[PDB]
Write an enzyme that holds these catalytic residues in place. Structure first.
Site, PDB file in Angstrom:
ATOM      1  N   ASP A  95       0.830  -1.215   0.000  1.00  0.00           N
ATOM      2  CA  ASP A  95       0.000   0.000   0.000  1.00  0.00           C
ATOM      3  C   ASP A  95       0.859   1.256   0.000  1.00  0.00           C
ATOM      4  O   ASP A  95       1.940   1.275   0.585  1.00  0.00           O
ATOM      5  CB  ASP A  95      -0.923   0.035   1.223  1.00  0.00           C
ATOM      6  CG  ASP A  95      -1.902  -1.122   1.259  1.00  0.00           C
ATOM      7  OD1 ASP A  95      -1.893  -1.961   0.327  1.00  0.00           O
ATOM      8  OD2 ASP A  95      -2.690  -1.188   2.226  1.00  0.00           O
ATOM      9  N   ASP A 100      -1.529  14.391   2.921  1.00  0.00           N
ATOM     10  CA  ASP A 100      -2.424  15.366   2.306  1.00  0.00           C
ATOM     11  C   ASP A 100      -2.290  16.771   2.908  1.00  0.00           C
ATOM     12  O   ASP A 100      -3.069  17.665   2.561  1.00  0.00           O
ATOM     13  CB  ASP A 100      -3.878  14.881   2.380  1.00  0.00           C
ATOM     14  CG  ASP A 100      -4.698  15.291   1.161  1.00  0.00           C
ATOM     15  OD1 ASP A 100      -4.304  16.244   0.447  1.00  0.00           O
ATOM     16  OD2 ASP A 100      -5.741  14.647   0.918  1.00  0.00           O
ATOM     17  N   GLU A 102       0.643  18.149   2.352  1.00  0.00           N
ATOM     18  CA  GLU A 102       1.446  18.696   1.252  1.00  0.00           C
ATOM     19  C   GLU A 102       0.482  19.221   0.193  1.00  0.00           C
ATOM     20  O   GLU A 102      -0.690  18.830   0.162  1.00  0.00           O
ATOM     21  CB  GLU A 102       2.370  17.642   0.614  1.00  0.00           C
ATOM     22  CG  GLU A 102       3.029  16.641   1.568  1.00  0.00           C
ATOM     23  CD  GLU A 102       3.748  17.291   2.726  1.00  0.00           C
ATOM     24  OE1 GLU A 102       4.320  18.384   2.535  1.00  0.00           O
ATOM     25  OE2 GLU A 102       3.750  16.698   3.826  1.00  0.00           O
ATOM     26  N   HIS A 119       8.035   6.911  -7.198  1.00  0.00           N
ATOM     27  CA  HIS A 119       8.971   6.510  -6.140  1.00  0.00           C
ATOM     28  C   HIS A 119       8.290   5.618  -5.099  1.00  0.00           C
ATOM     29  O   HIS A 119       8.895   4.663  -4.601  1.00  0.00           O
ATOM     30  CB  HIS A 119       9.554   7.771  -5.482  1.00  0.00           C
ATOM     31  CG  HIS A 119      10.424   7.508  -4.290  1.00  0.00           C
ATOM     32  ND1 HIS A 119      11.792   7.372  -4.383  1.00  0.00           N
ATOM     33  CD2 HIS A 119      10.124   7.409  -2.973  1.00  0.00           C
ATOM     34  CE1 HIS A 119      12.294   7.176  -3.176  1.00  0.00           C
ATOM     35  NE2 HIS A 119      11.304   7.192  -2.303  1.00  0.00           N
ATOM     36  N   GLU A 120       7.035   5.937  -4.778  1.00  0.00           N
ATOM     37  CA  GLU A 120       6.240   5.143  -3.840  1.00  0.00           C
ATOM     38  C   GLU A 120       5.871   3.774  -4.393  1.00  0.00           C
ATOM     39  O   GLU A 120       5.883   2.786  -3.659  1.00  0.00           O
ATOM     40  CB  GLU A 120       4.959   5.884  -3.442  1.00  0.00           C
ATOM     41  CG  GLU A 120       5.166   7.127  -2.577  1.00  0.00           C
ATOM     42  CD  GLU A 120       6.228   6.944  -1.505  1.00  0.00           C
ATOM     43  OE1 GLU A 120       6.217   5.900  -0.816  1.00  0.00           O
ATOM     44  OE2 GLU A 120       7.073   7.851  -1.357  1.00  0.00           O
ATOM     45  N   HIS A 123       8.529   1.357  -3.964  1.00  0.00           N
ATOM     46  CA  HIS A 123       8.452   0.708  -2.650  1.00  0.00           C
ATOM     47  C   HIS A 123       7.407  -0.409  -2.626  1.00  0.00           C
ATOM     48  O   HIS A 123       7.615  -1.439  -1.983  1.00  0.00           O
ATOM     49  CB  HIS A 123       8.138   1.723  -1.542  1.00  0.00           C
ATOM     50  CG  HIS A 123       9.214   2.739  -1.318  1.00  0.00           C
ATOM     51  ND1 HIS A 123      10.525   2.394  -1.063  1.00  0.00           N
ATOM     52  CD2 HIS A 123       9.169   4.091  -1.289  1.00  0.00           C
ATOM     53  CE1 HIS A 123      11.242   3.490  -0.897  1.00  0.00           C
ATOM     54  NE2 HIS A 123      10.444   4.535  -1.026  1.00  0.00           N
ATOM     55  N   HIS A 129      15.605   2.502  -0.870  1.00  0.00           N
ATOM     56  CA  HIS A 129      16.279   3.714  -1.326  1.00  0.00           C
ATOM     57  C   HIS A 129      17.661   3.464  -1.933  1.00  0.00           C
ATOM     58  O   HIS A 129      18.428   2.630  -1.449  1.00  0.00           O
ATOM     59  CB  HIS A 129      16.368   4.735  -0.186  1.00  0.00           C
ATOM     60  CG  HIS A 129      15.037   5.277   0.238  1.00  0.00           C
ATOM     61  ND1 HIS A 129      14.705   5.501   1.558  1.00  0.00           N
ATOM     62  CD2 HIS A 129      13.950   5.634  -0.486  1.00  0.00           C
ATOM     63  CE1 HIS A 129      13.476   5.980   1.627  1.00  0.00           C
ATOM     64  NE2 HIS A 129      12.994   6.066   0.400  1.00  0.00           N
TER      65      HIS A 129
END
Ligand SMILES: COc1ccc(S(=O)(=O)NCC(=O)NO)cc1
Ligand SMILES: [Ca+2]
Ligand SMILES: [Ca+2]
Ligand SMILES: [Ca+2]
Ligand SMILES: [Zn+2]
Ligand SMILES: [Zn+2]
EC number: 3.4.24.17
Length: 159
Positions: A95, A100, A102, A119-120, A123, A129
């Site tokens: 997940d 929110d 930001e 990027h998420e 993951h 990273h």
């Protein structure tokens, strides 16, 4: 490139995702576009085929949240942590959550949702990273690096 502890990877090629809710900052189509485009970045250089769901439990549940929101990593208001996601697995694993507090934007005048989601989703597919790189832990013509392609391919494979 780096992977999560115990080299976790999705043990299937067909993966499902659901956008549980939406930010106030953009229209829904802009959020869909950023996320859909974020999934293609990884889909293009792997045999992984993504499919969308509107009901039920998807592998990658995508949501926007603030502060404490049901996991051991509460968000921290504006700035700092923009988003986080979980390694491949059942439940909360896979997940991706977005802070929110930001200001999520289509462009670069705030926090770009597409770049962070890409990027998420890295993951979500088992990449941690990097040391150079999209998976580098800091937010800064966009193309996926060789170091990024190394990790996802030496894990799932090429298309
Ligand atoms: C653009 O790719 C990102 C996404 C998030 C972040 S961050 O929120 O500042 N660091 C947390 C993180 O690593 N999330 O995956 C940093 C870079
Ligand atoms: Ca999940
Ligand atoms: Ca934050
Ligand atoms: Ca917001
Ligand atoms: Zn979370
Ligand atoms: Zn990250």
């Amino acid at each position: 490139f780096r992977t999560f502890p115990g080299i976790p990877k999705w043990r299937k090629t067909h993966l499902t995702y659901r956008i549980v809710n939406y930010t106030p900052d953009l229209p829904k189509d802009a959020v869909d576009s950023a996320v859909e485009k974020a999934l293609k970045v990884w889909e293009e250089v792997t045999p992984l085929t993504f499919s969308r769901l509107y009901e039920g439990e998807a592998d990658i549940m995508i949501s926007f949240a603030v502060r404490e929101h049901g996991d051991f990593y509460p968000f921290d208001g504006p700035g700092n942590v923009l988003a986080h996601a979980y390694a491949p697995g059942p439940g909360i694993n896979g997940d991706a959550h977005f802070d929110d507090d930001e200001q999520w934007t289509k462009d670069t005048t705030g926090t770009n949702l597409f770049l962070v989601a890409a990027h998420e989703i890295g993951h979500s597919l088992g990449l941690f990273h990097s040391a150079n790189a999209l998976m580098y832990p800091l937010y800064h013509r966009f193309r996926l690096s060789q170091d990024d392609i190394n990790g996802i391919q030496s894990l799932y494979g090429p298309p």
